[PDB]
Enzyme design. Structure first.
Site, PDB file in Angstrom:
ATOM      1  N   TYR B  27       0.744  -1.254   0.000  1.00 23.65           N
ATOM      2  CA  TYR B  27       0.000   0.000   0.000  1.00 23.65           C
ATOM      3  C   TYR B  27       0.777   1.310   0.000  1.00 23.65           C
ATOM      4  O   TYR B  27       0.178   2.374  -0.139  1.00 23.65           O
ATOM      5  CB  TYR B  27      -0.984   0.031   1.173  1.00 23.65           C
ATOM      6  CG  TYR B  27      -2.099  -0.977   1.071  1.00 23.65           C
ATOM      7  CD1 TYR B  27      -1.904  -2.306   1.450  1.00 23.65           C
ATOM      8  CD2 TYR B  27      -3.350  -0.605   0.589  1.00 23.65           C
ATOM      9  CE1 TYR B  27      -2.933  -3.242   1.350  1.00 23.65           C
ATOM     10  CE2 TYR B  27      -4.385  -1.527   0.482  1.00 23.65           C
ATOM     11  CZ  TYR B  27      -4.173  -2.844   0.865  1.00 23.65           C
ATOM     12  OH  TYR B  27      -5.203  -3.754   0.765  1.00 23.65           O
ATOM     13  N   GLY B  29       3.053   2.564  -2.242  1.00 30.39           N
ATOM     14  CA  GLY B  29       3.023   3.222  -3.538  1.00 30.39           C
ATOM     15  C   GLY B  29       1.611   3.560  -3.982  1.00 30.39           C
ATOM     16  O   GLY B  29       0.648   3.099  -3.373  1.00 30.39           O
ATOM     17  N   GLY B  31      -2.000   3.660  -5.355  1.00 28.44           N
ATOM     18  CA  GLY B  31      -2.915   2.540  -5.473  1.00 28.44           C
ATOM     19  C   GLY B  31      -2.790   1.651  -4.252  1.00 28.44           C
ATOM     20  O   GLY B  31      -2.961   2.120  -3.131  1.00 28.44           O
ATOM     21  N   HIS B  47      -2.800   5.323   5.992  1.00 25.11           N
ATOM     22  CA  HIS B  47      -2.720   6.596   5.302  1.00 25.11           C
ATOM     23  C   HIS B  47      -3.642   6.595   4.085  1.00 25.11           C
ATOM     24  O   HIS B  47      -4.256   7.613   3.768  1.00 25.11           O
ATOM     25  CB  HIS B  47      -1.281   6.888   4.880  1.00 25.11           C
ATOM     26  CG  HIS B  47      -1.102   8.240   4.274  1.00 25.11           C
ATOM     27  ND1 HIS B  47      -1.191   8.463   2.919  1.00 25.11           N
ATOM     28  CD2 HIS B  47      -0.906   9.454   4.844  1.00 25.11           C
ATOM     29  CE1 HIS B  47      -1.058   9.755   2.677  1.00 25.11           C
ATOM     30  NE2 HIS B  47      -0.885  10.378   3.829  1.00 25.11           N
ATOM     31  N   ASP B  48      -3.743   5.453   3.409  1.00 29.40           N
ATOM     32  CA  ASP B  48      -4.621   5.338   2.244  1.00 29.40           C
ATOM     33  C   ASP B  48      -6.044   5.552   2.733  1.00 29.40           C
ATOM     34  O   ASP B  48      -6.831   6.283   2.131  1.00 29.40           O
ATOM     35  CB  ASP B  48      -4.515   3.946   1.614  1.00 29.40           C
ATOM     36  CG  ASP B  48      -3.290   3.788   0.738  1.00 29.40           C
ATOM     37  OD1 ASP B  48      -2.410   4.670   0.796  1.00 29.40           O
ATOM     38  OD2 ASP B  48      -3.201   2.782  -0.003  1.00 29.40           O
ATOM     39  N   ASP B  89      -0.974  12.819   6.952  1.00 30.65           N
ATOM     40  CA  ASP B  89       0.449  12.766   6.662  1.00 30.65           C
ATOM     41  C   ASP B  89       1.297  12.711   7.922  1.00 30.65           C
ATOM     42  O   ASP B  89       2.191  11.867   8.041  1.00 30.65           O
ATOM     43  CB  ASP B  89       0.836  13.962   5.779  1.00 30.65           C
ATOM     44  CG  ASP B  89       0.092  13.963   4.449  1.00 30.65           C
ATOM     45  OD1 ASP B  89      -0.455  12.900   4.073  1.00 30.65           O
ATOM     46  OD2 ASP B  89       0.062  15.016   3.775  1.00 30.65           O
TER      47      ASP B  89
HETATM   48 CA   LIG Z   1      -1.232   4.108  -1.792  1.00 38.52          CA
END
Ligand SMILES: [Ca+2]
Ligand SMILES: [Ca+2]
Lengths: 122, 122, 122, 122
Positions: B27, B29, B31, B47-48, B89
């Site tokens: 996860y 990168g 997508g 974070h996604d 973040d």
């Molecule tokens: Ca991601």
């Protein structure tokens, strides 16, 4: 919100905040630390400190209003915060204009390695 | 803004998000799918998710105010969006720093091949 | 491999892929849609397309051999995939250097959500 | 294809080519230029040169066979190229083993800037 600040920058420097100012030196773009590299970076450093003294406004960071009066970015009137925040942006935008004489495109996305110097207190 | 998140990550972990975190596991990168491989990858998963609840915001490009001068990441007051994003973040960067212990270089560039399975729900 | 592609890009344009190309226009990023905003963005368009013709290949991570020693990028012979990928990357890097003349900083961090419209076919 | 090489590297150094040797110094990972930084990098530089002398073979760069004979990576017999490519890989893999005494993780993803010295001739 920096929508108003960005507009002030555009007006003072003829440049868009992003990315010319959004990521310049050690302080333009926040996350600032170390020493501002040049006059432009110093404006952001000062802008940061300015916002820093507005401790009283951390509970309501109001979007302010300003206008162009006599060719001068002029802060409107409202809450003390709108005015102080606007004053910070105003001083900064103008400072950035004065700094256009030493602005260097090579300072954009300035490596953070050169910004790990002891930070200037404010 | 992605670059601010990258600076936070550098501040917190001492590693450049790219290439040590921008492609890590399933996860980190762009997508991402499957199941976080380790704490680091879980940081990215969260974070996604954190960004997922902010579709109304420009989680990737909105420039928010935050500070590092203090020695720790502080999110500045602003629009709901600028804060929520900065919060996402700050949290993920702190999280990555807290997962430095089990960071595996092997997981750096990870195939979306070994990242298939009932994609863990946010 | 992505990092080799970024090396070609540095060699060709003197700019690091990140951040100068990794998010440029509406196709240089880790997605892509709508219409290529300009020459540079067009290079990335053709690159996505080029990669698109290699579904059976690991376009992003396969490590291919190539040389910059000659003064120009040369793809070494290897598997068909390594060559096709390297070729895609080589053409794209060169295309970016040929497009330097119109590279506009303002396209650097282009919001995907805006440049919608009909995605141009490959 | 470096599949065989990577296996040779794994066997010699116990490390996976990626990312330990895929992006190291100036010449590991191809697209090398400048001067090898340390012994490990010099192996790749030599491996690169070794492939370069492999002039005759670009028209048919075929996968070679190798085995372990008495604990030694041993090139199999086949086309002259299979044996030359294999010999290049074999020497490089062994070289990386011996270079383990100076290997520095910090040299992974070695910065491009440091590799712009006049490239060492082969
Ligand atoms: Ca991601
Ligand atoms: Ca793309």
């Amino acid at each position: 919100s920096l929508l108003q600040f960005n507009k002030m920058i555009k007006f003072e420097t003829r440049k868009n905040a992003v990315p010319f100012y959004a990521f310049y030196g050690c302080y333009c773009g926040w996350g600032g630390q170390g020493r501002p590299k040049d006059a432009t970076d110093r404006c952001c450093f000062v802008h940061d400190c300015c916002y820093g003294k507005l401790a009283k406004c951390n509970t309501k960071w109001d979007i302010y209003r300003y206008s162009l009066k006599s060719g001068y970015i002029t802060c409107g009137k409202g809450t003390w915060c709108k005015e102080q925040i606007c004053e910070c942006d105003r001083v900064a935008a103008e400072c950035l204009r004065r700094s256009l004489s030493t602005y260097k495109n090579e300072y954009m996305f300035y490596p953070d390695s050169r910004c790990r110097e002891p930070s200037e207190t404010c």
